[PDB]
Amino acid sequence: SSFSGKYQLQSQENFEAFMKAIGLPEELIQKGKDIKGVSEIVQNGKHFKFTITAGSKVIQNEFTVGEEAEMETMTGEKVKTVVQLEGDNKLVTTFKNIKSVTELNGDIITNTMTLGDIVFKRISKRILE
Amino acid sequence: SSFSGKYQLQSQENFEAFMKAIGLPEELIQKGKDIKGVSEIVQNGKHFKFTITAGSKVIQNEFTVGEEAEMETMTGEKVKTVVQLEGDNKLVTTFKNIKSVTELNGDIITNTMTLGDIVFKRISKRILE
Ligand SMILES: CCCCCCCCCCCCCCCC(=O)O
Ligand SMILES: CCCCCCCCCCCCCCCC(=O)O
């Protein structure tokens, strides 16, 4: 129903391979790979505000599902894409050659980002306030 | 008693003035000045692990109070300093020309950094888990 909340990263798979493939500087990969930070989502209907801790960067994006949005990626590049709702608990988007699926299951969020043969997967858990 | 917790930034003063004074690019200042993120402290006796959300950057430092440690600053520079514990609720250190005081009262942390005539103050509140 609602994605809103604060989520702490629990585990992730293939961070280094994915970050190398998108061209992140090696120095930012090494300092960011072991950080387990907190991301915050604010949902108002179809409108989303994301404050994402990804490695050693904080990225803030907003968008409305189904509307074209301009989004900052991990490299700082801005991309124009549309985020779709699949079901009621999955956000799905494509940009460049990446497919991103954000799936909510109770207190667990799983983000899966596929780039060619690399699947970068983040599992986070809702902070219970 | 214990600093351990996740702390969400509530308010801050002189973020822009401090970041300009230490040489951060205006681009990074504008990106980060409105972010109200979560920082995490883990205390075990004299040992502290910090995961700090500072603007658009996440910085992860670790130190034992009273021992010289290398700490990453906002500029990416690693400084060697000693942090001391004053009482049970104040962390005090000085590096370059900055004095930093981190004070815990109840569930509120007040961080005050003084650089010349600029007092950079951050007020953050413990997330009640
Ligand atoms: C679509 C690009 C957004 C920014 C790219 C950063 C790479 C990681 C994105 C994961 C954010 C998904 C939100 C769930 C919480 C989390 O995993 O932090
Ligand atoms: C002294 C090394 C750290 C350098 C980073 C400076 C940016 C502000 C640091 C304040 C963190 C203090 C912990 C309380 C929580 C917070 O304010 O995020």
Curated annotation (Swiss-Prot), chains A, B:
The modification Phosphoserine is found at residues 11, 39, 56, 100. Changing residue 94 to A: Increases the binding for cholesterol; increases high density lipoprotein (HDL)- and low density lipoprotein (LDL)-mediated cholesterol uptake. Disulfide bonds: none annotated. The modification Phosphothreonine is found at residue 51. GO terms for cellular component: cytosol; extracellular exosome; nucleoplasm; nucleus; peroxisomal matrix. GO terms for biological process: cellular detoxification; cellular response to hydrogen peroxide; cellular response to hypoxia; fatty acid transport. InterPro entries: Calycin, Fatty_acid-bd, ILBP. One of its GO terms (molecular function) is antioxidant activity. It is found in: Cytoplasm. Belongs to the calycin superfamily. Fatty-acid binding protein (FABP) family. This is Fatty acid-binding protein, liver. It comes from Homo sapiens (Human). The gene is FABP1.
